[PDB]
Amino acid sequence: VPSWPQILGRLTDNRDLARGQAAWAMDQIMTGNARPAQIAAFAVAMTMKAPTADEVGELAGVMLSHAHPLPADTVPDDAVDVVGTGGDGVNTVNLSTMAAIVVAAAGVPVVKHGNRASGGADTLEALGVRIDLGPDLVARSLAEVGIGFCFAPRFHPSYRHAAAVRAEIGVPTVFNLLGPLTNPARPRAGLIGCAFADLAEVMAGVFAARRSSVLVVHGDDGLDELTTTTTSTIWRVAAGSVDKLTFDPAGFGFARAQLDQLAGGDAQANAAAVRAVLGGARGPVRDAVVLNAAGAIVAHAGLSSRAEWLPAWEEGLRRASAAIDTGAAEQLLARWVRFGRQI
Amino acid sequence: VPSWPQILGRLTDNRDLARGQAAWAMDQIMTGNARPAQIAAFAVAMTMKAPTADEVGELAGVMLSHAHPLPADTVPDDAVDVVGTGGDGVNTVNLSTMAAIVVAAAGVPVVKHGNRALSGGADTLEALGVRIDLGPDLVARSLAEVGIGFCFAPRFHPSYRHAAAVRAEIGVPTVFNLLGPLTNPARPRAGLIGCAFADLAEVMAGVFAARRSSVLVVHGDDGLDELTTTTTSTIWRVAAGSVDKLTFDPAGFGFARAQLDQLAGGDAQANAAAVRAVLGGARGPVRDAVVLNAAGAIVAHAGLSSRAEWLPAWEEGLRRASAAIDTGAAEQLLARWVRFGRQIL
Ligand SMILES: Nc1ccccc1C(=O)O
Ligand SMILES: Nc1ccccc1C(=O)O
Ligand SMILES: Nc1ccccc1C(=O)O
Ligand SMILES: Nc1ccccc1C(=O)O
């Protein structure tokens, strides 16, 4: 029976959708069969009717069902993502991009997913990295360099109609959740930042369903990363289940920082901040990077059922600091740049 | 300062808009400055937030400021409308249109707003041979010469085209579905106003209240945007700037309960035939529902005077509506309206 009037009516009636309806809607959007007004009505209605983990999972499933995959056996079983929803309002340095490099340098394979804004892809581009690569070359980068970056428009070309609408309406919706949930390499672990405190649990539910080992993180100051200005909320996903924790990095010797110390402007500035940290500059920015890099490593450790929380953090922090201090992180970036210049 | 992200963000945060924001939005929509996605987002977000009468008033106000007006001093001060939201999802006969003819024949000036839709009011008028395409000047002359005029929504609100398109693309009812009955370009002060959506009728009433109209906003408890004979109706009575909610039972005035299928409509030709049968004096449930709705419009008209009393008003309305059919006045008025249209220019 499925139709726009039926699905929209159910949503405007403040009712959860029936199984399969969110999937039908998203597939319409992804096959160029939904009008801009229909896309917009759906995105808004699905946000104002608080979306469920099942519903958001259906949306992400449809997108992944249409995306370009990586080739068979090119993504190690233990690869990790480090990524956020964005839209925390705060023009920060790209902590996720910095932490990703550090995590890769430490020997954990990283496949990152992202897009232009300031933003993650922009900062990478300004550092000289090729953000643009197709499946076969992203697989090569992962093999040879230890990190890869899937550019969203390259892998999700059928999302362009939905992307054009998000822009036109300019307001956050349920679609802002989809980036971290639709990494086309499908890594099973991640450190995932969520700007929308109310929706982080929903994102966690989605990861739990696919039995990922993920830490979904929201700084109690609003950051879509682990913060050093105060405590963070963590939705810890492992063994298909979610528990909510408060996390205080003071317990690992981290000084309280002020939010303005993690601020960064254009792609050029954030690129300078990356070089500064990877070059060994001390300060609040390094601390944040190390903390979030450790978080990603802890998420990676969680793939093993024998993993323990506090020992995992201590080892993650040691490994993250060493990766920077030895120059490994700095040199991984240099190798990543070199890789892109050599077909 | 005003922008789409600001207004839609406020709405998706479940907040009422600031004074003037809804007006800004509607004006962008009516000037061709809004993308279909923005129109759709706004209509939906406002509906799910729960629109206020201030907000709906602002939307209707912008529309009326862009509409083609009727010439000055051509609409009597006591002219009435008989019109509904539609969207009740039950194909009925054209009760508001039939009632409008009867009310005019009773001597109450009627300027009806309407649209095409099954067969909407405008479709059925066309099938009867009445002109639904007249501009402001000729509608004013219909009113003066025949006692009734019809304002076809698209002809008077051409700048609403972008919004009407989006409404149709998304299908789901929204706050926009309220706007037809609130935006009669002749701006009559009284009306019998149907609302298919029980949860929005009170807000419609509030808008009419703010304008100091004398209106009965009606919702059949069976779902119809008409006063029903099938069961009770909820009526938001608007007079003297204030609204109070009543339940109306036709059994109180001797009407038997009808079944909904007795009121069911068909194509425009079938619905035109149904109008002719009622105006010709056929008894039965359709006549009953027409007389009841014509009476309501006459009660709204009486309400323009603060002297009006509810039960005498309804008894006089019912008398007057019944007599207008029985004397042949209603039938003759329709013939004269058709003739008027055939001899223009
Ligand atoms: N902006 C995007 C994000 C994801 C997929 C496609 C696009 C696109 O622009 O086509
Ligand atoms: N907003 C995002 C965040 C992360 C990855 C992709 C996207 C995207 O725009 O599709
Ligand atoms: N559907 C409407 C509602 C109000 C005013 C005009 C129209 C129209 O279609 O022109
Ligand atoms: N229901 C109406 C009443 C009058 C004018 C237009 C409409 C409309 O919805 O298009």
Ligand SMILES: [Mg+2]
């Ligand atoms: Mg991030």
Ligand SMILES: [Mg+2]
């Ligand atoms: Mg960030």
Ligand SMILES: [Mg+2]
């Ligand atoms: Mg009607």
Ligand SMILES: [Mg+2]
């Ligand atoms: Mg009706």
